[PDB]
Design a protein around this ligand. Sequence first.
Ligand SMILES: CC(C)c1c(C(=O)NCc2ccccc2)nc(-c2ccc(F)cc2)n1CC[C@@H](O)C[C@@H](O)CC(=O)O
Ligand SMILES: CC(C)c1c(C(=O)NCc2ccccc2)nc(-c2ccc(F)cc2)n1CC[C@@H](O)C[C@@H](O)CC(=O)O
Ligand SMILES: CC(C)c1c(C(=O)NCc2ccccc2)nc(-c2ccc(F)cc2)n1CC[C@@H](O)C[C@@H](O)CC(=O)O
Ligand SMILES: CC(C)c1c(C(=O)NCc2ccccc2)nc(-c2ccc(F)cc2)n1CC[C@@H](O)C[C@@H](O)CC(=O)O
Lengths: 394, 414, 421, 421
Amino acid sequence: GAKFLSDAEIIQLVNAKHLIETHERGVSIRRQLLSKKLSEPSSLQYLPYRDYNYSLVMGACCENVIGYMPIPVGVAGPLCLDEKEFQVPMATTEGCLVASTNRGCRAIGLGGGASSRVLADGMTRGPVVRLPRACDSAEVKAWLETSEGFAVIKEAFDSTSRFARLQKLHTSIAGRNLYIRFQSRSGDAMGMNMISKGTEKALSKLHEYFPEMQILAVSGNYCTDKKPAAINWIEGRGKSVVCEAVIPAKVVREVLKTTTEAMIEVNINKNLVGSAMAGSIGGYNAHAANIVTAIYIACGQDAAQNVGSSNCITLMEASGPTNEDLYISCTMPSIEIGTVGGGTNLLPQQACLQMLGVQGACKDNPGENARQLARIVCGTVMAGELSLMAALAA
Amino acid sequence: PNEECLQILGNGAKFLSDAEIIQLVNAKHIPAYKLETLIETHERGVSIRRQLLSKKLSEPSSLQYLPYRDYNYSLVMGACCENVIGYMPIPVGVAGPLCLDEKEFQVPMATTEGCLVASTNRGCRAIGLGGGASSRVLADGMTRGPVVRLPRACDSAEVKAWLETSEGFAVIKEAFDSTSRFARLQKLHTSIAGRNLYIRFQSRSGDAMGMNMISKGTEKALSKLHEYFPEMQILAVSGNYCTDKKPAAINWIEGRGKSVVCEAVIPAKVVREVLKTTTEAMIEVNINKNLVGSAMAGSIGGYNAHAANIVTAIYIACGQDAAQNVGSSNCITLMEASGPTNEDLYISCTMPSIEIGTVGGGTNLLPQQACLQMLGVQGACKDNPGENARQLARIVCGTVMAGELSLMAALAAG
Amino acid sequence: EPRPNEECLQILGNAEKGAKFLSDAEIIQLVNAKHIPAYKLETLIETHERGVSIRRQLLSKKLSEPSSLQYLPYRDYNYSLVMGACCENVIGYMPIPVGVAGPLCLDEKEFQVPMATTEGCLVASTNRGCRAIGLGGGASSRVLADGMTRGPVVRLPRACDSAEVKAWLETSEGFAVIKEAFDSTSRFARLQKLHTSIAGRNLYIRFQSRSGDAMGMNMISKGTEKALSKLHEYFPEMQILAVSGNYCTDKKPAAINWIEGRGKSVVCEAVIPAKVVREVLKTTTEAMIEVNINKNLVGSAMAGSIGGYNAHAANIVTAIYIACGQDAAQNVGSSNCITLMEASGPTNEDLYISCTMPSIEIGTVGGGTNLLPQQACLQMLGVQGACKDNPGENARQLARIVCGTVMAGELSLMAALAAGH
Amino acid sequence: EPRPNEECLQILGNAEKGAKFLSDAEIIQLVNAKHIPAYKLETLIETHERGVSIRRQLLSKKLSEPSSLQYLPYRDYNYSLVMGACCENVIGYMPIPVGVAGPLCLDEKEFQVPMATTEGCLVASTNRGCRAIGLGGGASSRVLADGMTRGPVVRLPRACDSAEVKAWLETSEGFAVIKEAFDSTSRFARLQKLHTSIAGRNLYIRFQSRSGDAMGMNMISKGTEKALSKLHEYFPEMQILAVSGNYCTDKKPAAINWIEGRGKSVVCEAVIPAKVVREVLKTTTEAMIEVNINKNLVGSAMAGSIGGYNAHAANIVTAIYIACGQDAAQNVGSSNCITLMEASGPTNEDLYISCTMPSIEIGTVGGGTNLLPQQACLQMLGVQGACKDNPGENARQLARIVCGTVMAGELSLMAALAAGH
Ligand SMILES: CC(C)c1c(C(=O)NCc2ccccc2)nc(-c2ccc(F)cc2)n1CC[C@@H](O)C[C@@H](O)CC(=O)O
Ligand SMILES: CC(C)c1c(C(=O)NCc2ccccc2)nc(-c2ccc(F)cc2)n1CC[C@@H](O)C[C@@H](O)CC(=O)O
Ligand SMILES: CC(C)c1c(C(=O)NCc2ccccc2)nc(-c2ccc(F)cc2)n1CC[C@@H](O)C[C@@H](O)CC(=O)O
Ligand SMILES: CC(C)c1c(C(=O)NCc2ccccc2)nc(-c2ccc(F)cc2)n1CC[C@@H](O)C[C@@H](O)CC(=O)O
């Protein structure tokens, strides 16, 4: 069919208002078509495209594909976390970020290592519905708060998928509007699509009970997905995680080139008081976003979710017998993460997840690989906080 | 043999095999950090780093499908990344044409989220058929927000008052401006918290994002302030008052980097046939999702559907700092009725803190330069310093608006 | 004339004489030179009003204008209910004019709403909003949630320990034990679902319960201390750092009150016919919507508001609160409100309006509601004191009335701004 | 003796007789038969107290309990300064007990701070904080900025035109034209640099200026209207949607007031020797710091607070505001405060404390400061009315007193939270 034609001929056919057998040649043709519309057609010459596996990308991850964008991947490690060691991949183009995180890791290792805990777990979706009157939306809120109402909604939600297991609902009214926050674990997937499908069936079951209910939007921004929101900071979203470590005074001096007292003075007055003066919600840290973003790009995550996933409060305190040691913790209530689906279906992304031992589904305990990866992120963020904060104090 | 191979390093490393260098590290003849300088070529430094790393992993074959060969590590080494074991391919798709200020743009988007490019492209089509979009840059200046301490809050009050006088601001401006060509200090903004004093330095930065530049100007500026006030302590050159890579109302209100607005009118027929919904439905969803819903969620600056998706994809493609998506995605999306019978859709996106550049950082790498070249904004603009960065900022905001149109249409049609 | 301090103290210590036998000057002499500090004047001097008079005379000597208190009234006020309950070092009272806005037509009833203010035009403006609602068929309201909160901060040795405590509180058995201890402290103390938040080794625990018709702070605080005492039995290394760790949150702006509610969460609504908007409010439905969106939503959003998506709910909350013996400082959270306005009816020319206020902190028993003047204003509304046959119904009704009066005030001021003066 | 309606009406319409020649019962007879509208009572009745009396009588017969107003007082109060200035449809006044905390040792002076509250122990607790400050060698304060704001929203045809108007206001020549129009309205008006914000075709414009010793709302609003009139001459397509588009921001929580200031921005501080912390506050510096960090910074942070990094600033702000004739609804923003506690001295055993309050909205002229009782409390502090020679000094001084009294309250409540019980 298309194999017996040439490159010039197939371009002539689509131009004339009128399929291809190999994925890489389809990319090549799309690149040549695009060149015709650019002022500099030679601009694509150093954008690569050759010998990348487009089979896993077409239809699943990307459209109108013209190549790929290489992001340098460095390793910060070993990170000593919950009695294990992790070599953490970090895809970035910011100078010194991987070296600085690496120093944070070294400080943590010498201090006995870090311990972390996952405090909560459940991706959310927050549709907006409308009723004729505020008295009607109030009725629906009351009904969703009975055990009988919650049970029928749970049955409908949980029918859509193996890992669909609905947790306590959260609701807010604004006149005749009602926002409904559905939360559920989702195996090792980040869970956006799963929870959305569950939410649609739950909302259709709710329609049966309340026929005058309009479903205005399956996402009414009450989730909240990929925008700053106090609701994510307070209620959590995805994995809520806490990590901690004590850095001996000697290590703060030799490795970090500062003191425990100076580190505490900067953290309080930068990460708490300064974030406070700037009007931050959830941004009580130095640069958690750098680490989250770098790990996310390396590990096939949705990097747009660094908006909520980077929420972090970094606290530093005096510790030990002489009160000269550095206690540090990071608390990240809304880490949106997964080891199956999305960009984690791609082979290079899986290489980075494999380094950490979290690639794919955990067959023995659904959701444990994603939980582990969240812990690693929170741990690596803490390393980053240590090093950069030390650089600022000194 | 161990000690024979050590003598060959002293003369060089090219005359030893991979295995002999690795054996030299494992037995402690040579420390692992000394491989950076000794090994000549960059790709063989990456290869030996990988092989050393692989034997430490629970799965030795983990890095099999992580590519590393035939990539330009020369630009990456000592500038963009360290402990490099390879690189991560992010698919690039193209959305366009985007009809913006009488130009057409083919917008590159680096993402792994399915249908994002296709959806954004459909937004672009509704905009093209509506007569195009128009944007303006409203403000420009990267910031840095150090925190200094004085012994008493009365002293910090003294310093703030001095910085607010015409005379004092002039002396600080001169020290700041001396560091760079583009460094031109705008009006200072300060907040006291007791004896803490937070000073927000703001300055244009040519076509660079400007973080490093404004930081150098800040250090020398605070050096001159130290002369007028010896008891002042420089606690941290960033005291989170910038604010960089964290959510902050100050960025939303004062702006950071490029503040931008974009707008378009989409005829009713284009809303029906291209977007598969009505103007009345789009407006009802925008109000109750992007305003009221974001309000009920306690959002500062997140009055949009999915601005972050587009900001992130363009940023990765175009060599930006993708972590700056935190502040750069700040956006309010507004929809209202338009035209004679209120049946046309007016849309605007306003994004007060797009942090962006076309020189420096990831924009120094060649694949990223290719994507910047597509848009006609690669490198520095010689005739008009800052114009390439301002143009990219306008493309981001316009592409965001096309994204909002498409996703909001899909939510309205349910 | 005043005799020496020694004789005066013997007359003071004598049971059959007391302070009644001493002069104002002699009382003032004993204070000036210790023996009596000043705060013991209340528990010594014959009458409350004389104690105030003495206090005013002492204060006046200290001031740079001795006649400063001349027009600060004090005589013939019922101080007996104020002493040891509502106020200390009392030198008098501050008259706040009270107007009446109504009838407020709400849930098929009519209310005459008292309002204590010094802002010109507030009561008349609110009365105009009431008239518009009344001619539109009236307002409807619903209490969506009810529970005063306290948000202590406790610390464990490590974050891992605080996580253990969070998880234990989340089990049915752990919560049951804590609920038992909380609920044992009072007949109204009925602990609802807990929300907790970790920050390192800190653990913030938000206790929520109804509290009859009382605002409930004192009662919830008592419940909380007993619950934390019980939690310490299971976790002996837990330090209670503060019974309030600002997680409640009380009298400070906080997203948590907006999102979770605090006290009473209420919604009110009404439809104003097109004609009524023109005749009473001197504007149009179309114009009110456009101002509401671009001021109360978009303007509030550009200013970086959490919970402040309204025009002047604070004006109404404060005036009703002062009038009705509420804690006026709680206007900070009680003012939280989103005001919404859209087109309604066959024509799509009628004005739908709603006010949602998630954190009205209110009560008809305790605190300032113990005083007779503020009880007269509660009596107007039919909500004074406890409702015996339905505990909490009076405070619920008062929250409904606040939300409804806020909506009246929203209608009127938004019409004024739309009509350009 | 009560006459028929028609006879009563001739007397009412007789210009040398009027309502004075009718009985209360006859005026009420006329009102119930719809001859006189109830709102017109104000200008028909001679004495204002009598107007209040008849309004109450009409009101009582509408209430579920007719005797509900018995203990709402009304007699012998000066309604002359209230009627058509501070309140409408007046049925009496509401006594709020006034207590006094002090001496507050602030900027080498001593203040006797008046506080109108119904919360038990607030005055005594604030008084204890004052004592700790006084024995610690005093507090020092500075007004860091000063200017009331108004934040109108205007609409242009397109976002491109709103952008044009913004750029025009930012030129030195365009600003000058606007500043001339603004400053022409009042001798105190001095327009500072303009802050602006776009949302599509909306433009929010934040006018800021001093206002003498007035709080300044009506003055700034007058100057805003004149300034936008001038702006309309250069951009006649501009539509002035609302003179307040919530960008001020007045009486709602808003990050803009926190970050930019509104009214007076003030900072206060003091060092409390360890000995005073022990004897007055019953605790240690170490314990107070740990509570302050984890409650007022971390707790407020976990609650998602903007500007509420304090314990009970609103308690003190509200009490002084009611006493001193301020607008108590402005406590919403005026309570914005960050309280910071730090170790000081050679063994880290003294307590550095500071409160920073960026948006104190305050005045000593106009509004409720026109009433005599409120003026008595202003006279107490030596700040009543206008400062002739140094305009603004009285309002500034009151703002410093509010910030310092807040710091006193923070000291005392935080010490009580730190010790326990
Ligand atoms: C690359 C890292 C992340 C870094 C470091 C750093 O970690 N230095 C120590 C080091 C370096 C190399 C090896 C070992 C140790 N210092 C800075 C820095 C700080 C202030 C300044 F003015 C300019 C540069 N940055 C960039 C921070 C930037 O990405 C977020 C920052 O703006 C967030 C904030 O703190 O506000
Ligand atoms: C990939 C895009 C961005 C997209 C679309 C989309 O644009 N669809 C129309 C279309 C598709 C294909 C070709 C042409 C046009 N619909 C959804 C979606 C919404 C709700 C739902 F339940 C599940 C999927 N998403 C994901 C949104 C997601 O990444 C941010 C979203 O969560 C932000 C929000 O609205 O809160
Ligand atoms: C006293 C009331 C509350 C009021 C009215 C009002 O309701 N007028 C109509 C009316 C009057 C009398 C009888 C019947 C109807 N107009 C204003 C006003 C607006 C803008 C302006 F520049 C200056 C005065 N205010 C003060 C608003 C003030 O307390 C919160 C306001 O600042 C909150 C905001 O909108 O941002
Ligand atoms: C009335 C004052 C302000 C006060 C005091 C107080 O100041 N005590 C020391 C004292 C007393 C008497 C004389 C001398 C010194 N303690 C409490 C209190 C704390 C925890 C508790 F569970 C219940 C009561 N409150 C009420 C605080 C309340 O109005 C805002 C508070 O809720 C704000 C907060 O901390 O979240």
